[PDB]
Amino acid sequence: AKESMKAREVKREKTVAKYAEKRKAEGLQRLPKNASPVRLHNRCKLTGRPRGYIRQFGISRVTFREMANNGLIPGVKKASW
């Protein structure tokens, strides 16, 4: 969750912006090995915390719980059935 480690994700995301037509055209691949979609781990996008992630809200479980409790996500309620 360090600043360097969370900025590494942004650097890799900015690196995988080009080469979108190069990787689309088992050989002929001399790349910086960072322009691949297999190295993009998803963070919490506020704190930058791995080990728990929801694609819908894009944040970790602890931030999701705290915001859903203190009314920051429209729609969430207390599930009961």
């Binding site: 819908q56 809200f57 894009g58 409790n69 203190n70 009314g71 429209p74 729609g75 309620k77 207390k78």
Partner: protein, 206 residues
């Protein structure tokens, strides 16, 4: 920590949501921007003692309706006092942005203005003993029968933590139909960080 948030289990009930925007699976950056706008507003104008930021993220628009404790210094003269704030937050979130400043009805009953005022008195280090009763009296002058202010450890520059009840009246937290608003604001002193929790019970809603 063995108590649920009082406004947490009240959303499908009398308590509503702060933000207002329906996006199917697209919370993402629309949530990151809503998280940054509130903190940017609270850091840019804190001397007005803001109460809440109703963020309405509809199509091609974002309304930033601000409920303060002092709208005079926010509107300012002629509107250029809002001009810089608006160009700032709009170039932070480069989209079509509108602002609406709301006036306050008895600012001593907001469950957050009380907390931030007590925190400011604490970090100003006057007595730590007059602020809680000041807030209690200024809140119980009027209605909202229940008020409960609880404070956390690191008190009076001591070594071990301790908590004080300091409550009076009636605050039925076990009743979903009670209209208990609450907001936690804490003071960053030199002996650490002191936490404040304010519950306000106005009355049953229907």
């Amino acid at each position: 920590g063995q108590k649920t948030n009082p406004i947490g289990n009240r959303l499908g009930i009398i308590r509503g949501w702060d933000s207002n925007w329906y996006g199917g699976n697209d919370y993402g950056d629309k949530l990151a921007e809503d998280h940054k706008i509130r903190k940017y507003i609270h850091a840019r104008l804190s001397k007005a003692s803001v109460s809440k930021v109703i963020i309405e993220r509809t199509l091609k628009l974002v309304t930033v309706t601000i409920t303060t404790a002092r709208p005079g210094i926010i509107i300012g003269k002629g509107g250029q006092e809002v001009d810089k704030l608006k160009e700032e937050l709009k170039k932070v979130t480069d989209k079509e942005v509108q602002i609406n400043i709301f006036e306050i009805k008895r600012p001593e009953l907001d469950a957050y203005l009380v907390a931030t005022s007590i925190a400011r008195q604490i970090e100003s280090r006057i007595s730590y003993r007059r602020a809680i009763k000041m807030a209690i009296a200024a809140s119980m002058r009027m209605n909202a029968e229940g008020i409960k202010v609880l404070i956390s450890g690191r008190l009076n520059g001591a070594e071990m933590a301790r908590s004080e009840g300091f409550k009076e009246g009636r605050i039925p937290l076990s009743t979903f139909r009670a209209d208990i608003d609450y907001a936690l604001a804490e003071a960053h002193t030199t002996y650490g960080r002191m936490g404040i929790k304010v519950w306000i019970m106005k009355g049953e809603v229907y």
